[PDB]
Amino acid sequence: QNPQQLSANLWAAVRARGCQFLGPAMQEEALKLVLLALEDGSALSRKVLVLFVVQRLEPRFPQASKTSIGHVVQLLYRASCFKVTKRDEDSSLMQLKEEFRSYEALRREHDAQIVHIAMEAGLRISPEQWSSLLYGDLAHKSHMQSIIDKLQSPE
């Protein structure tokens, strides 16, 4: 598998799992809004989190929708970023775990989850291409290498 097939297969795999990556710039801003909502420990349902983000994101990125922001939220859920609460018949609320209440940390779980999906899908992808895929540059090679290590090997 050449680079072009790897990337196409990756995003198929992500969408296949009810998740979504919106592109490096858009996803960045999406995560920044999630964190704006949750960094102080507020506890929001899917509905309310989605509504919060989509209303701030659509002006700058008009392709944004409830569905697609739902999928990003799903990605972060699938990555165990949230403490989830339930009082019967209220909706499930999500809080960011304390350890993930910063852009750098949250972004690391996020990136890891996508890498995990590549693994579930049998897709071997180098750190250079990972940086390209998730950041649109090559300055995050080492950051991604580190994530691969932690997913493959016990520390």
PDB file of all heavy atoms in Angstrom, residues 108-145, unseen atoms left out:
ATOM      1  N   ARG A 108      -3.199  14.693  22.294  1.00  0.00           N
ATOM      2  CA  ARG A 108      -2.461  13.430  22.352  1.00  0.00           C
ATOM      3  C   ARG A 108      -3.354  12.191  22.425  1.00  0.00           C
ATOM      4  O   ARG A 108      -3.139  11.220  21.704  1.00  0.00           O
ATOM      5  CB  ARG A 108      -1.461  13.442  23.507  1.00  0.00           C
ATOM      6  CG  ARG A 108      -0.408  12.342  23.421  1.00  0.00           C
ATOM      7  CD  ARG A 108       0.562  12.287  24.596  1.00  0.00           C
ATOM      8  NE  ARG A 108       0.999  13.615  25.058  1.00  0.00           N
ATOM      9  CZ  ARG A 108       0.443  14.343  26.037  1.00  0.00           C
ATOM     10  NH1 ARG A 108      -0.618  13.914  26.720  1.00  0.00           N
ATOM     11  NH2 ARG A 108       0.960  15.529  26.341  1.00  0.00           N
ATOM     12  N   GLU A 109      -4.372  12.217  23.270  1.00  0.00           N
ATOM     13  CA  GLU A 109      -5.342  11.104  23.291  1.00  0.00           C
ATOM     14  C   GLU A 109      -6.024  10.947  21.953  1.00  0.00           C
ATOM     15  O   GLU A 109      -6.234   9.833  21.444  1.00  0.00           O
ATOM     16  CB  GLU A 109      -6.424  11.334  24.323  1.00  0.00           C
ATOM     17  CG  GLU A 109      -5.935  11.310  25.765  1.00  0.00           C
ATOM     18  CD  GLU A 109      -4.877  10.255  26.022  1.00  0.00           C
ATOM     19  OE1 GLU A 109      -5.190   9.053  25.997  1.00  0.00           O
ATOM     20  OE2 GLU A 109      -3.717  10.619  26.239  1.00  0.00           O
ATOM     21  N   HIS A 110      -6.387  12.086  21.387  1.00  0.00           N
ATOM     22  CA  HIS A 110      -7.062  12.124  20.091  1.00  0.00           C
ATOM     23  C   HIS A 110      -6.201  11.471  19.041  1.00  0.00           C
ATOM     24  O   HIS A 110      -6.616  10.503  18.404  1.00  0.00           O
ATOM     25  CB  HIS A 110      -7.376  13.572  19.731  1.00  0.00           C
ATOM     26  CG  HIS A 110      -7.765  13.782  18.305  1.00  0.00           C
ATOM     27  ND1 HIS A 110      -6.838  13.929  17.298  1.00  0.00           N
ATOM     28  CD2 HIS A 110      -8.978  13.928  17.732  1.00  0.00           C
ATOM     29  CE1 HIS A 110      -7.464  14.123  16.157  1.00  0.00           C
ATOM     30  NE2 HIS A 110      -8.763  14.131  16.394  1.00  0.00           N
ATOM     31  N   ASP A 111      -4.986  11.979  18.888  1.00  0.00           N
ATOM     32  CA  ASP A 111      -4.098  11.434  17.875  1.00  0.00           C
ATOM     33  C   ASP A 111      -3.906   9.910  18.084  1.00  0.00           C
ATOM     34  O   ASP A 111      -3.983   9.122  17.160  1.00  0.00           O
ATOM     35  CB  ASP A 111      -2.777  12.177  17.907  1.00  0.00           C
ATOM     36  CG  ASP A 111      -2.904  13.654  17.547  1.00  0.00           C
ATOM     37  OD1 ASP A 111      -3.997  14.106  17.119  1.00  0.00           O
ATOM     38  OD2 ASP A 111      -1.902  14.391  17.726  1.00  0.00           O
ATOM     39  N   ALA A 112      -3.752   9.502  19.328  1.00  0.00           N
ATOM     40  CA  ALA A 112      -3.572   8.091  19.685  1.00  0.00           C
ATOM     41  C   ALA A 112      -4.736   7.230  19.248  1.00  0.00           C
ATOM     42  O   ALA A 112      -4.564   6.112  18.749  1.00  0.00           O
ATOM     43  CB  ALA A 112      -3.342   7.951  21.202  1.00  0.00           C
ATOM     44  N   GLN A 113      -5.936   7.734  19.461  1.00  0.00           N
ATOM     45  CA  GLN A 113      -7.115   6.989  19.083  1.00  0.00           C
ATOM     46  C   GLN A 113      -7.144   6.716  17.600  1.00  0.00           C
ATOM     47  O   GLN A 113      -7.520   5.620  17.174  1.00  0.00           O
ATOM     48  CB  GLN A 113      -8.363   7.752  19.491  1.00  0.00           C
ATOM     49  CG  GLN A 113      -9.672   7.079  19.087  1.00  0.00           C
ATOM     50  CD  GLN A 113      -9.866   5.634  19.581  1.00  0.00           C
ATOM     51  OE1 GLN A 113     -10.686   4.900  19.041  1.00  0.00           O
ATOM     52  NE2 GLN A 113      -9.135   5.237  20.607  1.00  0.00           N
ATOM     53  N   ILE A 114      -6.751   7.705  16.808  1.00  0.00           N
ATOM     54  CA  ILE A 114      -6.723   7.519  15.362  1.00  0.00           C
ATOM     55  C   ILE A 114      -5.664   6.484  14.970  1.00  0.00           C
ATOM     56  O   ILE A 114      -5.892   5.633  14.091  1.00  0.00           O
ATOM     57  CB  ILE A 114      -6.528   8.862  14.635  1.00  0.00           C
ATOM     58  CG1 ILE A 114      -7.774   9.724  14.846  1.00  0.00           C
ATOM     59  CG2 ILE A 114      -6.364   8.628  13.145  1.00  0.00           C
ATOM     60  CD1 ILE A 114      -7.636  11.151  14.419  1.00  0.00           C
ATOM     61  N   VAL A 115      -4.526   6.543  15.660  1.00  0.00           N
ATOM     62  CA  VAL A 115      -3.453   5.596  15.405  1.00  0.00           C
ATOM     63  C   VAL A 115      -3.928   4.191  15.769  1.00  0.00           C
ATOM     64  O   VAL A 115      -3.660   3.234  15.052  1.00  0.00           O
ATOM     65  CB  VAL A 115      -2.184   5.950  16.191  1.00  0.00           C
ATOM     66  CG1 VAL A 115      -1.106   4.915  15.939  1.00  0.00           C
ATOM     67  CG2 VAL A 115      -1.658   7.320  15.794  1.00  0.00           C
ATOM     68  N   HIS A 116      -4.658   4.094  16.884  1.00  0.00           N
ATOM     69  CA  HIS A 116      -5.214   2.812  17.334  1.00  0.00           C
ATOM     70  C   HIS A 116      -6.143   2.201  16.289  1.00  0.00           C
ATOM     71  O   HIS A 116      -6.164   0.989  16.063  1.00  0.00           O
ATOM     72  CB  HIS A 116      -6.001   2.963  18.632  1.00  0.00           C
ATOM     73  CG  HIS A 116      -6.369   1.645  19.249  1.00  0.00           C
ATOM     74  ND1 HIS A 116      -7.622   1.081  19.127  1.00  0.00           N
ATOM     75  CD2 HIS A 116      -5.629   0.756  19.951  1.00  0.00           C
ATOM     76  CE1 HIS A 116      -7.646  -0.086  19.741  1.00  0.00           C
ATOM     77  NE2 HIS A 116      -6.444  -0.313  20.240  1.00  0.00           N
ATOM     78  N   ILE A 117      -6.916   3.070  15.652  1.00  0.00           N
ATOM     79  CA  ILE A 117      -7.803   2.648  14.608  1.00  0.00           C
ATOM     80  C   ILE A 117      -7.023   2.132  13.412  1.00  0.00           C
ATOM     81  O   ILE A 117      -7.362   1.074  12.879  1.00  0.00           O
ATOM     82  CB  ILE A 117      -8.751   3.763  14.214  1.00  0.00           C
ATOM     83  CG1 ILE A 117      -9.707   4.001  15.376  1.00  0.00           C
ATOM     84  CG2 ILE A 117      -9.524   3.359  12.968  1.00  0.00           C
ATOM     85  CD1 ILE A 117     -10.485   5.278  15.276  1.00  0.00           C
ATOM     86  N   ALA A 118      -5.965   2.835  13.021  1.00  0.00           N
ATOM     87  CA  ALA A 118      -5.091   2.345  11.950  1.00  0.00           C
ATOM     88  C   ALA A 118      -4.608   0.944  12.270  1.00  0.00           C
ATOM     89  O   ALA A 118      -4.584   0.072  11.402  1.00  0.00           O
ATOM     90  CB  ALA A 118      -3.913   3.272  11.752  1.00  0.00           C
ATOM     91  N   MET A 119      -4.263   0.713  13.532  1.00  0.00           N
ATOM     92  CA  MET A 119      -3.819  -0.617  13.957  1.00  0.00           C
ATOM     93  C   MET A 119      -4.924  -1.655  13.872  1.00  0.00           C
ATOM     94  O   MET A 119      -4.725  -2.711  13.310  1.00  0.00           O
ATOM     95  CB  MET A 119      -3.256  -0.560  15.364  1.00  0.00           C
ATOM     96  CG  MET A 119      -1.873   0.067  15.400  1.00  0.00           C
ATOM     97  SD  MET A 119      -1.444   0.698  17.048  1.00  0.00           S
ATOM     98  CE  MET A 119       0.347   0.712  16.968  1.00  0.00           C
ATOM     99  N   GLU A 120      -6.094  -1.343  14.418  1.00  0.00           N
ATOM    100  CA  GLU A 120      -7.252  -2.215  14.265  1.00  0.00           C
ATOM    101  C   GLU A 120      -7.457  -2.587  12.798  1.00  0.00           C
ATOM    102  O   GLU A 120      -7.826  -3.701  12.482  1.00  0.00           O
ATOM    103  CB  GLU A 120      -8.528  -1.549  14.789  1.00  0.00           C
ATOM    104  CG  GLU A 120      -8.611  -1.353  16.287  1.00  0.00           C
ATOM    105  CD  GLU A 120      -9.776  -0.442  16.669  1.00  0.00           C
ATOM    106  OE1 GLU A 120     -10.905  -0.693  16.202  1.00  0.00           O
ATOM    107  OE2 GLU A 120      -9.566   0.548  17.409  1.00  0.00           O
ATOM    108  N   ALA A 121      -7.222  -1.640  11.904  1.00  0.00           N
ATOM    109  CA  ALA A 121      -7.436  -1.862  10.464  1.00  0.00           C
ATOM    110  C   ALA A 121      -6.227  -2.446   9.713  1.00  0.00           C
ATOM    111  O   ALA A 121      -6.258  -2.559   8.514  1.00  0.00           O
ATOM    112  CB  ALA A 121      -7.881  -0.568   9.821  1.00  0.00           C
ATOM    113  N   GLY A 122      -5.182  -2.856  10.418  1.00  0.00           N
ATOM    114  CA  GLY A 122      -4.006  -3.427   9.789  1.00  0.00           C
ATOM    115  C   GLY A 122      -3.176  -2.441   8.986  1.00  0.00           C
ATOM    116  O   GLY A 122      -2.385  -2.854   8.174  1.00  0.00           O
ATOM    117  N   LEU A 123      -3.312  -1.141   9.224  1.00  0.00           N
ATOM    118  CA  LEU A 123      -2.632  -0.149   8.395  1.00  0.00           C
ATOM    119  C   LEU A 123      -1.344   0.335   9.000  1.00  0.00           C
ATOM    120  O   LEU A 123      -1.343   0.909  10.079  1.00  0.00           O
ATOM    121  CB  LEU A 123      -3.529   1.048   8.161  1.00  0.00           C
ATOM    122  CG  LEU A 123      -4.815   0.737   7.396  1.00  0.00           C
ATOM    123  CD1 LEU A 123      -5.693   1.972   7.347  1.00  0.00           C
ATOM    124  CD2 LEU A 123      -4.538   0.223   5.998  1.00  0.00           C
ATOM    125  N   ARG A 124      -0.234   0.086   8.311  1.00  0.00           N
ATOM    126  CA  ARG A 124       1.096   0.491   8.791  1.00  0.00           C
ATOM    127  C   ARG A 124       1.440   1.839   8.176  1.00  0.00           C
ATOM    128  O   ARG A 124       1.465   1.989   6.969  1.00  0.00           O
ATOM    129  CB  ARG A 124       2.122  -0.604   8.428  1.00  0.00           C
ATOM    130  CG  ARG A 124       3.231  -0.886   9.446  1.00  0.00           C
ATOM    131  CD  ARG A 124       3.935  -2.189   9.051  1.00  0.00           C
ATOM    132  NE  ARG A 124       4.983  -2.659   9.958  1.00  0.00           N
ATOM    133  CZ  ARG A 124       5.904  -3.572   9.631  1.00  0.00           C
ATOM    134  NH1 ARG A 124       5.923  -4.129   8.420  1.00  0.00           N
ATOM    135  NH2 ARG A 124       6.823  -3.941  10.519  1.00  0.00           N
ATOM    136  N   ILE A 125       1.666   2.827   9.026  1.00  0.00           N
ATOM    137  CA  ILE A 125       1.826   4.214   8.604  1.00  0.00           C
ATOM    138  C   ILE A 125       2.950   4.821   9.401  1.00  0.00           C
ATOM    139  O   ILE A 125       2.962   4.753  10.629  1.00  0.00           O
ATOM    140  CB  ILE A 125       0.535   5.014   8.825  1.00  0.00           C
ATOM    141  CG1 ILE A 125      -0.614   4.385   8.025  1.00  0.00           C
ATOM    142  CG2 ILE A 125       0.701   6.476   8.404  1.00  0.00           C
ATOM    143  CD1 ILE A 125      -1.989   4.969   8.308  1.00  0.00           C
ATOM    144  N   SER A 126       3.895   5.431   8.706  1.00  0.00           N
ATOM    145  CA  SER A 126       5.077   5.960   9.345  1.00  0.00           C
ATOM    146  C   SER A 126       4.754   7.227  10.152  1.00  0.00           C
ATOM    147  O   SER A 126       3.771   7.919   9.891  1.00  0.00           O
ATOM    148  CB  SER A 126       6.102   6.297   8.272  1.00  0.00           C
ATOM    149  OG  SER A 126       5.539   7.188   7.341  1.00  0.00           O
ATOM    150  N   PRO A 127       5.619   7.569  11.109  1.00  0.00           N
ATOM    151  CA  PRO A 127       5.481   8.874  11.806  1.00  0.00           C
ATOM    152  C   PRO A 127       5.459  10.113  10.903  1.00  0.00           C
ATOM    153  O   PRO A 127       4.773  11.085  11.243  1.00  0.00           O
ATOM    154  CB  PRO A 127       6.736   8.945  12.698  1.00  0.00           C
ATOM    155  CG  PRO A 127       7.279   7.568  12.731  1.00  0.00           C
ATOM    156  CD  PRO A 127       6.859   6.872  11.478  1.00  0.00           C
ATOM    157  N   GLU A 128       6.206  10.095   9.790  1.00  0.00           N
ATOM    158  CA  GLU A 128       6.231  11.285   8.905  1.00  0.00           C
ATOM    159  C   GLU A 128       4.847  11.490   8.312  1.00  0.00           C
ATOM    160  O   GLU A 128       4.320  12.590   8.331  1.00  0.00           O
ATOM    161  CB  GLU A 128       7.269  11.307   7.758  1.00  0.00           C
ATOM    162  CG  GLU A 128       7.886   9.981   7.395  1.00  0.00           C
ATOM    163  CD  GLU A 128       8.966   9.582   8.355  1.00  0.00           C
ATOM    164  OE1 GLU A 128      10.089  10.151   8.280  1.00  0.00           O
ATOM    165  OE2 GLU A 128       8.664   8.710   9.188  1.00  0.00           O
ATOM    166  N   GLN A 129       4.277  10.420   7.788  1.00  0.00           N
ATOM    167  CA  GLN A 129       2.973  10.499   7.179  1.00  0.00           C
ATOM    168  C   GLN A 129       1.874  10.792   8.217  1.00  0.00           C
ATOM    169  O   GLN A 129       0.897  11.496   7.913  1.00  0.00           O
ATOM    170  CB  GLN A 129       2.716   9.221   6.388  1.00  0.00           C
ATOM    171  CG  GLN A 129       1.256   8.944   6.057  1.00  0.00           C
ATOM    172  CD  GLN A 129       1.087   7.990   4.878  1.00  0.00           C
ATOM    173  OE1 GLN A 129       0.289   8.243   3.985  1.00  0.00           O
ATOM    174  NE2 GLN A 129       1.840   6.881   4.875  1.00  0.00           N
ATOM    175  N   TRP A 130       2.038  10.270   9.431  1.00  0.00           N
ATOM    176  CA  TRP A 130       1.140  10.607  10.507  1.00  0.00           C
ATOM    177  C   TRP A 130       1.145  12.103  10.794  1.00  0.00           C
ATOM    178  O   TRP A 130       0.080  12.714  10.958  1.00  0.00           O
ATOM    179  CB  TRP A 130       1.489   9.842  11.774  1.00  0.00           C
ATOM    180  CG  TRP A 130       0.905   8.477  11.819  1.00  0.00           C
ATOM    181  CD1 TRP A 130       1.569   7.303  11.796  1.00  0.00           C
ATOM    182  CD2 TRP A 130      -0.476   8.163  11.862  1.00  0.00           C
ATOM    183  NE1 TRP A 130       0.690   6.273  11.833  1.00  0.00           N
ATOM    184  CE2 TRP A 130      -0.580   6.773  11.876  1.00  0.00           C
ATOM    185  CE3 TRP A 130      -1.648   8.931  11.886  1.00  0.00           C
ATOM    186  CZ2 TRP A 130      -1.807   6.116  11.936  1.00  0.00           C
ATOM    187  CZ3 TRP A 130      -2.881   8.271  11.942  1.00  0.00           C
ATOM    188  CH2 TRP A 130      -2.944   6.882  11.956  1.00  0.00           C
ATOM    189  N   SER A 131       2.323  12.713  10.826  1.00  0.00           N
ATOM    190  CA  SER A 131       2.402  14.155  11.081  1.00  0.00           C
ATOM    191  C   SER A 131       1.699  14.905   9.974  1.00  0.00           C
ATOM    192  O   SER A 131       0.904  15.814  10.201  1.00  0.00           O
ATOM    193  CB  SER A 131       3.859  14.611  11.182  1.00  0.00           C
ATOM    194  OG  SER A 131       3.917  16.005  11.474  1.00  0.00           O
ATOM    195  N   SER A 132       2.016  14.519   8.754  1.00  0.00           N
ATOM    196  CA  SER A 132       1.348  15.074   7.589  1.00  0.00           C
ATOM    197  C   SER A 132      -0.182  14.917   7.718  1.00  0.00           C
ATOM    198  O   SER A 132      -0.921  15.877   7.588  1.00  0.00           O
ATOM    199  CB  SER A 132       1.894  14.391   6.353  1.00  0.00           C
ATOM    200  OG  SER A 132       1.202  14.840   5.229  1.00  0.00           O
ATOM    201  N   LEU A 133      -0.641  13.710   8.013  1.00  0.00           N
ATOM    202  CA  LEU A 133      -2.083  13.430   8.080  1.00  0.00           C
ATOM    203  C   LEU A 133      -2.837  14.172   9.160  1.00  0.00           C
ATOM    204  O   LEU A 133      -3.983  14.576   8.951  1.00  0.00           O
ATOM    205  CB  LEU A 133      -2.348  11.940   8.301  1.00  0.00           C
ATOM    206  CG  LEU A 133      -2.056  11.030   7.117  1.00  0.00           C
ATOM    207  CD1 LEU A 133      -1.958   9.576   7.535  1.00  0.00           C
ATOM    208  CD2 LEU A 133      -3.129  11.226   6.078  1.00  0.00           C
ATOM    209  N   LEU A 134      -2.217  14.348  10.311  1.00  0.00           N
ATOM    210  CA  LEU A 134      -2.928  14.926  11.439  1.00  0.00           C
ATOM    211  C   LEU A 134      -2.600  16.412  11.685  1.00  0.00           C
ATOM    212  O   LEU A 134      -3.374  17.108  12.321  1.00  0.00           O
ATOM    213  CB  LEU A 134      -2.654  14.100  12.687  1.00  0.00           C
ATOM    214  CG  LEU A 134      -3.047  12.621  12.680  1.00  0.00           C
ATOM    215  CD1 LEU A 134      -2.624  11.945  13.969  1.00  0.00           C
ATOM    216  CD2 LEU A 134      -4.542  12.409  12.488  1.00  0.00           C
ATOM    217  N   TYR A 135      -1.469  16.888  11.183  1.00  0.00           N
ATOM    218  CA  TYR A 135      -1.070  18.266  11.408  1.00  0.00           C
ATOM    219  C   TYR A 135      -0.823  19.051  10.139  1.00  0.00           C
ATOM    220  O   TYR A 135      -0.724  20.279  10.191  1.00  0.00           O
ATOM    221  CB  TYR A 135       0.161  18.323  12.326  1.00  0.00           C
ATOM    222  CG  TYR A 135      -0.155  17.878  13.711  1.00  0.00           C
ATOM    223  CD1 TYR A 135      -0.113  16.535  14.063  1.00  0.00           C
ATOM    224  CD2 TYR A 135      -0.568  18.793  14.656  1.00  0.00           C
ATOM    225  CE1 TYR A 135      -0.448  16.119  15.331  1.00  0.00           C
ATOM    226  CE2 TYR A 135      -0.920  18.402  15.916  1.00  0.00           C
ATOM    227  CZ  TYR A 135      -0.842  17.065  16.257  1.00  0.00           C
ATOM    228  OH  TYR A 135      -1.196  16.688  17.529  1.00  0.00           O
ATOM    229  N   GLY A 136      -0.745  18.376   8.995  1.00  0.00           N
ATOM    230  CA  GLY A 136      -0.473  19.065   7.744  1.00  0.00           C
ATOM    231  C   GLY A 136       0.937  19.618   7.696  1.00  0.00           C
ATOM    232  O   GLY A 136       1.210  20.527   6.933  1.00  0.00           O
ATOM    233  N   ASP A 137       1.838  19.071   8.503  1.00  0.00           N
ATOM    234  CA  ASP A 137       3.245  19.443   8.445  1.00  0.00           C
ATOM    235  C   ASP A 137       4.104  18.209   8.809  1.00  0.00           C
ATOM    236  O   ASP A 137       3.588  17.086   8.861  1.00  0.00           O
ATOM    237  CB  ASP A 137       3.515  20.640   9.342  1.00  0.00           C
ATOM    238  CG  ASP A 137       3.229  20.368  10.804  1.00  0.00           C
ATOM    239  OD1 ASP A 137       3.667  19.299  11.313  1.00  0.00           O
ATOM    240  OD2 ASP A 137       2.587  21.225  11.451  1.00  0.00           O
ATOM    241  N   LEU A 138       5.412  18.406   8.964  1.00  0.00           N
ATOM    242  CA  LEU A 138       6.327  17.326   9.353  1.00  0.00           C
ATOM    243  C   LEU A 138       6.996  17.584  10.684  1.00  0.00           C
ATOM    244  O   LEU A 138       7.951  16.888  11.042  1.00  0.00           O
ATOM    245  CB  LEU A 138       7.412  17.142   8.282  1.00  0.00           C
ATOM    246  CG  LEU A 138       6.887  16.787   6.897  1.00  0.00           C
ATOM    247  CD1 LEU A 138       7.963  17.012   5.842  1.00  0.00           C
ATOM    248  CD2 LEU A 138       6.364  15.350   6.859  1.00  0.00           C
ATOM    249  N   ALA A 139       6.534  18.609  11.402  1.00  0.00           N
ATOM    250  CA  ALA A 139       7.156  18.994  12.684  1.00  0.00           C
ATOM    251  C   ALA A 139       6.701  18.123  13.833  1.00  0.00           C
ATOM    252  O   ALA A 139       7.303  18.143  14.881  1.00  0.00           O
ATOM    253  CB  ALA A 139       6.889  20.444  12.991  1.00  0.00           C
ATOM    254  N   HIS A 140       5.668  17.320  13.617  1.00  0.00           N
ATOM    255  CA  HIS A 140       5.134  16.438  14.648  1.00  0.00           C
ATOM    256  C   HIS A 140       5.533  14.958  14.460  1.00  0.00           C
ATOM    257  O   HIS A 140       4.921  14.072  15.036  1.00  0.00           O
ATOM    258  CB  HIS A 140       3.601  16.576  14.699  1.00  0.00           C
ATOM    259  CG  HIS A 140       3.120  17.938  15.116  1.00  0.00           C
ATOM    260  ND1 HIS A 140       3.262  19.056  14.321  1.00  0.00           N
ATOM    261  CD2 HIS A 140       2.476  18.357  16.234  1.00  0.00           C
ATOM    262  CE1 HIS A 140       2.740  20.103  14.937  1.00  0.00           C
ATOM    263  NE2 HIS A 140       2.263  19.706  16.104  1.00  0.00           N
ATOM    264  N   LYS A 141       6.596  14.702  13.711  1.00  0.00           N
ATOM    265  CA  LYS A 141       7.126  13.338  13.510  1.00  0.00           C
ATOM    266  C   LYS A 141       7.426  12.633  14.831  1.00  0.00           C
ATOM    267  O   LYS A 141       7.021  11.490  15.063  1.00  0.00           O
ATOM    268  CB  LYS A 141       8.415  13.396  12.665  1.00  0.00           C
ATOM    269  CG  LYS A 141       8.934  12.050  12.181  1.00  0.00           C
ATOM    270  N   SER A 142       8.159  13.319  15.697  1.00  0.00           N
ATOM    271  CA  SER A 142       8.596  12.738  16.946  1.00  0.00           C
ATOM    272  C   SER A 142       7.404  12.488  17.851  1.00  0.00           C
ATOM    273  O   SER A 142       7.311  11.446  18.507  1.00  0.00           O
ATOM    274  CB  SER A 142       9.601  13.706  17.562  1.00  0.00           C
ATOM    275  OG  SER A 142       9.880  13.407  18.894  1.00  0.00           O
ATOM    276  N   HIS A 143       6.518  13.466  17.927  1.00  0.00           N
ATOM    277  CA  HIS A 143       5.298  13.343  18.726  1.00  0.00           C
ATOM    278  C   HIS A 143       4.518  12.097  18.332  1.00  0.00           C
ATOM    279  O   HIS A 143       4.044  11.356  19.200  1.00  0.00           O
ATOM    280  CB  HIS A 143       4.437  14.592  18.546  1.00  0.00           C
ATOM    281  CG  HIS A 143       3.024  14.445  19.010  1.00  0.00           C
ATOM    282  ND1 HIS A 143       2.663  14.538  20.336  1.00  0.00           N
ATOM    283  CD2 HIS A 143       1.876  14.264  18.319  1.00  0.00           C
ATOM    284  CE1 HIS A 143       1.353  14.406  20.438  1.00  0.00           C
ATOM    285  NE2 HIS A 143       0.854  14.242  19.228  1.00  0.00           N
ATOM    286  N   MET A 144       4.397  11.849  17.037  1.00  0.00           N
ATOM    287  CA  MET A 144       3.674  10.678  16.589  1.00  0.00           C
ATOM    288  C   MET A 144       4.458   9.387  16.863  1.00  0.00           C
ATOM    289  O   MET A 144       3.873   8.364  17.223  1.00  0.00           O
ATOM    290  CB  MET A 144       3.305  10.786  15.101  1.00  0.00           C
ATOM    291  CG  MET A 144       2.334  11.905  14.771  1.00  0.00           C
ATOM    292  SD  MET A 144       0.778  11.911  15.686  1.00  0.00           S
ATOM    293  CE  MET A 144       0.184  10.241  15.469  1.00  0.00           C
ATOM    294  N   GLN A 145       5.767   9.421  16.641  1.00  0.00           N
ATOM    295  CA  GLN A 145       6.609   8.260  16.921  1.00  0.00           C
ATOM    296  C   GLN A 145       6.374   7.808  18.353  1.00  0.00           C
ATOM    297  O   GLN A 145       6.152   6.642  18.625  1.00  0.00           O
ATOM    298  CB  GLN A 145       8.084   8.622  16.751  1.00  0.00           C
ATOM    299  CG  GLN A 145       9.042   7.484  16.999  1.00  0.00           C
ATOM    300  CD  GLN A 145       8.818   6.359  16.004  1.00  0.00           C
ATOM    301  OE1 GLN A 145       9.290   6.436  14.869  1.00  0.00           O
ATOM    302  NE2 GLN A 145       8.150   5.288  16.434  1.00  0.00           N
TER     303      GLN A 145
END
